[PDB]
Amino acid sequence: GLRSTFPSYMAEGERLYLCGEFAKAAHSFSNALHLQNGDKNCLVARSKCFLKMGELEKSLADAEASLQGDPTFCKGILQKAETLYTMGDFEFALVFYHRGYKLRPDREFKVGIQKAQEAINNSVGSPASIKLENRSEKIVRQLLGELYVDKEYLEKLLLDEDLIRGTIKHGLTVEDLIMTGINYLDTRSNFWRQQKPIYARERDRKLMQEK
Amino acid sequence: ILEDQLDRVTCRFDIQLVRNATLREELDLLRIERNRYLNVDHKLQKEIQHL
Amino acid sequence: QRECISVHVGQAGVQIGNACWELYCLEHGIQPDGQMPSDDSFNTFFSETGAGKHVPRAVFVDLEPTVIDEVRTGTYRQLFHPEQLITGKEDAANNYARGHYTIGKELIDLVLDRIRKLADQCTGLQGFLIFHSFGGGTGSGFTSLLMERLSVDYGKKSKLEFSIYPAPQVSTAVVEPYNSILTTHTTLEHSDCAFMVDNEAIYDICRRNLDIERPTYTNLNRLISQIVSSITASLRFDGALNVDLTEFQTNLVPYPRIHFPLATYAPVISAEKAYHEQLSVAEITNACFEPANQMVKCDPRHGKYMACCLLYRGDVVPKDVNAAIAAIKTKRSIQFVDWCPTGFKVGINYQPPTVVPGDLAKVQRAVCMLSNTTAIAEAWARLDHKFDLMYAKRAFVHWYVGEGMEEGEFSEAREDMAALEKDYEEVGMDSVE
Amino acid sequence: MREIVHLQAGQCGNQIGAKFWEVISDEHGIDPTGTYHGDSDLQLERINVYYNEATGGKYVPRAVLVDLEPGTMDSVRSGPFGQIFRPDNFVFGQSGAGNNWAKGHYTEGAELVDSVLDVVRKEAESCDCLQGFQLTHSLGGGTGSGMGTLLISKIREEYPDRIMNTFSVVPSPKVSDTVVEPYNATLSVHQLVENTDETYCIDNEALYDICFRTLKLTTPTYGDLNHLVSATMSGVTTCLRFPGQLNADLRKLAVNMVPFPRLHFFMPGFAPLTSRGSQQYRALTVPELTQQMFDAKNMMAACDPRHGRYLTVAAVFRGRMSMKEVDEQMLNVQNKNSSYFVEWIPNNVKTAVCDIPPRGLKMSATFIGNSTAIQELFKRISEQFTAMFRRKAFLHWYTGEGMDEMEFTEAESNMNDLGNPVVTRGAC
Amino acid sequence: MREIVHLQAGQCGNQIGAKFWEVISDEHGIDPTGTYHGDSDLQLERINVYYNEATGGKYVPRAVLVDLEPGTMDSVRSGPFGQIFRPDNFVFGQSGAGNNWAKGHYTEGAELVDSVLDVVRKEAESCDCLQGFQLTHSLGGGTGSGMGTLLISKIREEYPDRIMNTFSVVPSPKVSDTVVEPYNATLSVHQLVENTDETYCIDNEALYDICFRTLKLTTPTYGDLNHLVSATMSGVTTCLRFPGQLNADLRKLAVNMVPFPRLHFFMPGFAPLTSRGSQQYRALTVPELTQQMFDAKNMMAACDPRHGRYLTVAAVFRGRMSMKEVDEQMLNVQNKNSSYFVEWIPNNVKTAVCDIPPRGLKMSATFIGNSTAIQELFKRISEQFTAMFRRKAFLHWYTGEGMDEMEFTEAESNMNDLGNPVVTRGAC
Amino acid sequence: LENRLEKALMKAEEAEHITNVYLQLKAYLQEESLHLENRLDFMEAEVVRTKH
Amino acid sequence: KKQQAVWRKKKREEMEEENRRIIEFAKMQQQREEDWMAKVQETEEKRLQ
Ligand SMILES: Nc1nc2c(ncn2[C@@H]2O[C@H](COP(=O)(O)OP(=O)(O)OP(=O)(O)O)[C@@H](O)[C@H]2O)c(=O)[nH]1
Numbered sequence A: 001g002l003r004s005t006f007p008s009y010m011a012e013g014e015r016l017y018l019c020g021e022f023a024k025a026a027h028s029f030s031n032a033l034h035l036q037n038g039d040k041n042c043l044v045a046r047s048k049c050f051l052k053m054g055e056l057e058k059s060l061a062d063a064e065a066s067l068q069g070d071p072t073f074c075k076g077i078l079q080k081a082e083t084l085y086t087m088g089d090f091e092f093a094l095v096f097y098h099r100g101y102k103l104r105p106d107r108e109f110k111v112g113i114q115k116a117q118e119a120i121n122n123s124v125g126s127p128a129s130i131k132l133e134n135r136s137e138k139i140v141r142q143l144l145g146e147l148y149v150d151k152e153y154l155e156k157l158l159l160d161e162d163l164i165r166g167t168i169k170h171g172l173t174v175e176d177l178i179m180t181g182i183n184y185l186d187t188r189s190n191f192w193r194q195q196k197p198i199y200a201r202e203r204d205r206k207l208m209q210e211k
Numbered sequence B: 001i002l003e004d005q006l007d008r009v010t011c012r013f014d015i016q017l018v019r020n021a022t023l024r025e026e027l028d029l030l031r032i033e034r035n036r037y038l039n040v041d042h043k044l045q046k047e048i049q050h051l
Numbered sequence C: 001q002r003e004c005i006s007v008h009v010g011q012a013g014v015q016i017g018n019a020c021w022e023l024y025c026l027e028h029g030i031q032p033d034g035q036m037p038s039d040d041s042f043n044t045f046f047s048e049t050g051a052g053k054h055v056p057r058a059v060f061v062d063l064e065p066t067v068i069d070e071v072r073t074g075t076y077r078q079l080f081h082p083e084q085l086i087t088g089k090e091d092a093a094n095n096y097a098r099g100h101y102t103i104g105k106e107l108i109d110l111v112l113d114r115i116r117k118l119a120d121q122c123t124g125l126q127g128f129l130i131f132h133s134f135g136g137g138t139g140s141g142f143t144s145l146l147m148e149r150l151s152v153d154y155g156k157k158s159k160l161e162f163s164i165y166p167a168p169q170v171s172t173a174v175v176e177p178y179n180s181i182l183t184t185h186t187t188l189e190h191s192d193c194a195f196m197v198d199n200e201a202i203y204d205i206c207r208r209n210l211d212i213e214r215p216t217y218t219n220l221n222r223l224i225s226q227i228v229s230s231i232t233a234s235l236r237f238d239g240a241l242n243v244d245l246t247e248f249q250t251n252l253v254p255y256p257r258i259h260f261p262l263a264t265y266a267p268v269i270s271a272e273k274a275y276h277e278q279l280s281v282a283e284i285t286n287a288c289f290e291p292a293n294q295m296v297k298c299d300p301r302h303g304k305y306m307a308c309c310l311l312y313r314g315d316v317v318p319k320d321v322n323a324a325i326a327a328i329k330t331k332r333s334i335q336f337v338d339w340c341p342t343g344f345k346v347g348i349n350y351q352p353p354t355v356v357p358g359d360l361a362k363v364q365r366a367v368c369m370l371s372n373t374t375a376i377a378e379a380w381a382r383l384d385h386k387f388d389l390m391y392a393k394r395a396f397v398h399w400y401v402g403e404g405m406e407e408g409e410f411s412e413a414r415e416d417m418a419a420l421e422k423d424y425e426e427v428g429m430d431s432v433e
Numbered sequence D, E: 001m002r003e004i005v006h007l008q009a010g011q012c013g014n015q016i017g018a019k020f021w022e023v024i025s026d027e028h029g030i031d032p033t034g035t036y037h038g039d040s041d042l043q044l045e046r047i048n049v050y051y052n053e054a055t056g057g058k059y060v061p062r063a064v065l066v067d068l069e070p071g072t073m074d075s076v077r078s079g080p081f082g083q084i085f086r087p088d089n090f091v092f093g094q095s096g097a098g099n100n101w102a103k104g105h106y107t108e109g110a111e112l113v114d115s116v117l118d119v120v121r122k123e124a125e126s127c128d129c130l131q132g133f134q135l136t137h138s139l140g141g142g143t144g145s146g147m148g149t150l151l152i153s154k155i156r157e158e159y160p161d162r163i164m165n166t167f168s169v170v171p172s173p174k175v176s177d178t179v180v181e182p183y184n185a186t187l188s189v190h191q192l193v194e195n196t197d198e199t200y201c202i203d204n205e206a207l208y209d210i211c212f213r214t215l216k217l218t219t220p221t222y223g224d225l226n227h228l229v230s231a232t233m234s235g236v237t238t239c240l241r242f243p244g245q246l247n248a249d250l251r252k253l254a255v256n257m258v259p260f261p262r263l264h265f266f267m268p269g270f271a272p273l274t275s276r277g278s279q280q281y282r283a284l285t286v287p288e289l290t291q292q293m294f295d296a297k298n299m300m301a302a303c304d305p306r307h308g309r310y311l312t313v314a315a316v317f318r319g320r321m322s323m324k325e326v327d328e329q330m331l332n333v334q335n336k337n338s339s340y341f342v343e344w345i346p347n348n349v350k351t352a353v354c355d356i357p358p359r360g361l362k363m364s365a366t367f368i369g370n371s372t373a374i375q376e377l378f379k380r381i382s383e384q385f386t387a388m389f390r391r392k393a394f395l396h397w398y399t400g401e402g403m404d405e406m407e408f409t410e411a412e413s414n415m416n417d418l419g420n421p422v423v424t425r426g427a428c
Numbered sequence F: 001l002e003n004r005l006e007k008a009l010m011k012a013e014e015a016e017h018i019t020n021v022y023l024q025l026k027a028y029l030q031e032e033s034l035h036l037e038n039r040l041d042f043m044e045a046e047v048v049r050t051k052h
Numbered sequence G: 001k002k003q004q005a006v007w008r009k010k011k012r013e014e015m016e017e018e019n020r021r022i023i024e025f026a027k028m029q030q031q032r033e034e035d036w037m038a039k040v041q042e043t044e045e046k047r048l049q
């Protein structure tokens, strides 16, 4: 059964979150919830851990599971705005950052407001793309930044069968580890596509060259 | 202070990138040695199979 | 031709080894510097570079400096090749994990590197005399890592060991019990013979037979060292009935698990006292089975001596030993087992005990009784009940879990340790059927 | 290779850690000019744990000094060992805290942590592999609590694997020194919860108790008071500066004496202490040291162990001696005072024996105990906090400096949740 | 056997080169009277890089000082190292330029340019082989910009295979000293672009930033500012005069730091800079030298280097140090800021040590940097010129002195024409 | 400056997870480098036994 | 061992010589600037007289 006390598990989870062992921090915070269901601070920390590790849907679900009891809870509002931001809904991140800023004038809420404001202004602005009614290598090269060599080193690890067969941990065979990594790369590249779209990328050079 | 903190995060990313490249070199050495091991293993399995 | 790579891992070893090596040197002549002011009584533990520099054969390793630094800047500054004393950076802060998981890998590759070099340049690697501290960090953490990564290579080659079992009533590390259980969970399936010793016992012995009215570590280590000297005499000086390392194992570890023997020196008599005693073969052999000379706080007068390996060093007529053995096999108390009629393993190696300028007096005789008592289970249960009260309200566990280990381990360990109890128990029962 | 960066906050922490710097400068042979005049070779052997190298053998302490009032800086300058530190380490400000946690945390202090952290960062990057920070402060009043907690939290976010030994002067029961002691104390220890690893509480009432009854001093001044707390501040970090068997570091002590990650509040004591006239009659051996130690009059904080149960205790001994004496005295103390020790932690004493004695003495040993007697201090200042807070008094100058009622209620709720485990472990 | 001819143009150029001659006369052992009271053979080994000869040890510098008003010559003569120059090298003119670029380039300066070229030919022809010409001036104002760039054009035409260093002080962002500094800087750089090989821009506001809280000075003089400029100016030409491993001369620096013919405006830096109160506390080594080198402080031009990715960095060290530590610290800084260097130029670090440090220190290092951060300074001067010029203000004293609108339009066109590539190459 | 700071912060955030997958893959590889040559030598032992 | 000890002693000696060199130049620079300050100050004093 559950063996130690709730603030001990919370301090444990905060220490593991600081040290960077995000899976063990998430497990400790889950044990803390098993001790006491519905602690808003523990849901916020568990959402922060999944936000860091890359499981955005449960990071969101923990954010609403922190916020339904007190819709004025500032840390939960900040966490939900962060997770919606990194998921891609910059509009909903912006409105939740505004709610948090109005509830309490904090630097992190303000910072998130300029984050979502820049994200929306980069894609839209005012003239923008002209639109049509209607209905890879270089693209990921400029989306991923200087991480492209890490990317193709990961697929060079994909393209070896002895690297597919592995025995890391109980079942965490290194094929799955490589999948978790490359999936984080794919989600981060998709996020960079929503953050600065490719049409904004040549809009940079078009506000350039002609100038 | 904003410019100091920005230079921080840039330098942290740069040390991170270069030590990541060192990790790639170490991984490539281990992969090539264990690929040679694979070649010897596949050979020896072929003669044991035929025998 | 017949060498034995020595290995000290942690304050415990480094300290007991400063003594062990001091003793090994004065057992030959090697003046603390390397030169040997004038034979094969060197290759067993000392190499030889055309220069008179008789170089030692240890790896004195310790996750933290300090302990080792002293050796480097001490009277034995030279001896140890300036790369056989692998230090580190921070300390294992009493955390099995810290030295078997986190700040241990960084140094593990080097530690084995020098063991490899040492091995390559050794005709016959009879065995490795490892020295750790069951209860503690490096001594448990790094030791697991080391001992384990020694079977992955020099497997067949045996691996003896000496360790200071977490004492019964004393103890100094509040997290000592934890460390011990996890370490007997790893060694059990790796080592070949862990001559576990204990501080409390030696401490007392020093007050009742050496007249030391305030024993300290030096003193304790001194005895521990002379025991290792005894186990390493046949593989060096000659005699009449020799015993290699393989012999002390195929004659003292009954089944493939009960391999944790207890030892005791015999003529442990303060100098200004021997003048009144005849310290002969009898006296020493009898005193060797005394309930208060055992070097581990355990009551042999409550178990069943499974098998013993009396190793008599010094001038011992090989017809008086048989006499003693007989006059001990009639004495009831000393109860043996219903599955081992043969008594012990006689062994003589002419070479009077050395007298490292210290306390223990000299005697033209000596014997080290390495014995596999079934009583050691009593000291095992003690620390198991101690681990019990600790692994109950998750005490000092957050520190070990945020170091890399999983709560599962401490639990898995408890299971294995409890099975060790079952074993000693079954091996003790009879078989009239 | 080990090093600790020393950070001092407020006038209290500034003066106390200043006296620490004279204490270990005298221990390590450093004169006020910064060069070396000593006797033993084992004295440069770990000099660069507290003293960074500089050209010409002019060793410079690795300490930063912080305050909003630029007069304690001048006091430290005009002190005897004043010209020893770096001049860029003396980060000051032209402002006034006013003994406000809100003005140490959410105003000008928060604008000045941007610079004090950079100085700390240069001192930490000019190193090999860091172990700990050592913050000296007072929980009562501002700056030391106000800037103290923000420096606490930001340095913990920066370096998350380092011990931060923070030594705090707690408010006293009989007397008091800055009207808003309960607000600052509770609202600071709230941040001290989820951040540090070794917080040592020192109380001025037990300070005068040991100055009067034990030392038999006539007119004891803050020089001698900070001398006592600086001696127990130099006593812990001796196995990482001098050799000896059974060495003990900061993680050694923290992993030893933190059973649960929040119960990290300790009770110090330096105890080879005697009066100028008693020495002639006093006998100095290990049993006498143990008996004068474990008694509840050498405690540096006003929390009696007889009203609670020890969890774990360390004694970092220093000096040439035997150790069967210390083993027999530790087990004799456990067997004699058995009801006052926890049963779920057996054999809960530490011996940590540095070889080098302090100058002028033959043996010393610093006591560090983790009791349940901290319950009385916590409950007392919680009662005082509630007594002020139920009427909303001395509060408008935190609400106007940028705070709300809710954060104060969170701090008091979290500190009552500190008070719960210390009684659940006293009731098993 | 190598020589460098020296030119001083303007009041600023005259003062800054007089301090240059003081510093390198101290370095080369020449007294006020001109005689050589030396103590090292390496000192007199290559004294014939900056000093022509006489009878009686009277080593006279190969500098020819010009100005448009005969008072700064009197000031330099009345200075402490005033009786060292050859007296007919004081090429003066009984007039005043009036901070007018036209009055130095197309008017009364031009009737003195002939005598200046005569005396420059006199100094240059008494040589075996030359590297080129170093010329010190103010980028804004008259004289040093008026006669200055015309002098650049005439010697660059008449000696077309010589490196021409130009040490120019640039108008500052915060303030200015003549109203028509935006005119003078633009018109001067319009000639500096397609003439010179190595232009070093030094800004007074960056000099004040360095001198106030790195040197910790309170009453800084123009003597101290030109002392810093003379320090970096003596540091750049170190391997032509003093021995050492991995020497680097002017052409080697030019080919290692000028990738493209117009991208030759640099940003210098000299940084063993210790305050007087903290010189004892310093820990002088090449890691701290490299840290203070590449920190965005010690560059003497007020361009923030974090707002522009570097093109090429060179460091000429002076003193005895291991090139192992030097070479690994320069790798460490190249990898410390990697997004601040161009990725289309790998390994864009030039290092060069020489044995003899500047005498009075132990280790030193002059940093020269081609960066894309000069875009902010050039863009700022362009904005000021456009604001001044759109309303046709302060212009009739150029039109009546012999110009047209076409010259100013081409000057701004060239300003922007060099502003485009310094932004183009910051983004591949 | 604020936007650039947070941009680079989340870039650095991604980079430590790249580090965290590389270290574990290195751990697997260095674990196999120990049980490489012994299993190989047992394989030629199988070969020579099969020859006889 | 003997020759290595002599070599390192010689290196320490030349380091001490270089230290003496830089200190005596610091003294000479101070002396020159204070003579310059003296002549400026006496000019100022007799002009105010
Ligand atoms: N003979 C001897 N035994 C020691 C010595 N030091 C410690 N021990 C024993 O070791 C136990 C704790 O020390 P260790 O386990 O060796 O600590 P460690 O292995 O060095 O691990 P770290 O302290 O983290 O470096 C104590 O209970 C002692 O019984 C010593 O110097 N000599």
Ligand SMILES: Nc1nc2c(ncn2[C@@H]2O[C@H](COP(=O)(O)OP(=O)(O)O)[C@@H](O)[C@H]2O)c(=O)[nH]1
Pocket (backbone or CB within 6 Å): D009, D010, D011, D012, D015, D016, D067, D097, D099, D138, D140, D141, D142, D143, D144, D145, D169, D171, D176, D177, D178, D204, D222, D223, D225, D226, D229
């Ligand atoms: N030991 C010791 N404690 C002191 C000394 N000076 C002040 N204190 C304590 O410091 C507390 C008040 O400090 P505070 O006013 O908050 O300092 P601040 O941080 O600068 O605002 C009082 O309770 C005193 O007990 C000293 O010299 N030695």
Ligand SMILES: Nc1nc2c(ncn2[C@@H]2O[C@H](COP(=O)(O)OP(=O)(O)O)[C@@H](O)[C@H]2O)c(=O)[nH]1
Pocket (backbone or CB within 6 Å): E009, E010, E011, E012, E015, E016, E099, E138, E140, E141, E142, E143, E144, E145, E169, E177, E178, E204, E222, E223, E225, E226, E229
């Ligand atoms: N470094 C340095 N700069 C100076 C000195 N004297 C003047 N300056 C700079 O020269 C600039 C103006 O000089 P300027 O008007 O062109 O003199 P002019 O050429 O005779 O007209 C100012 O911005 C000063 O910063 C000096 O002695 N040292």
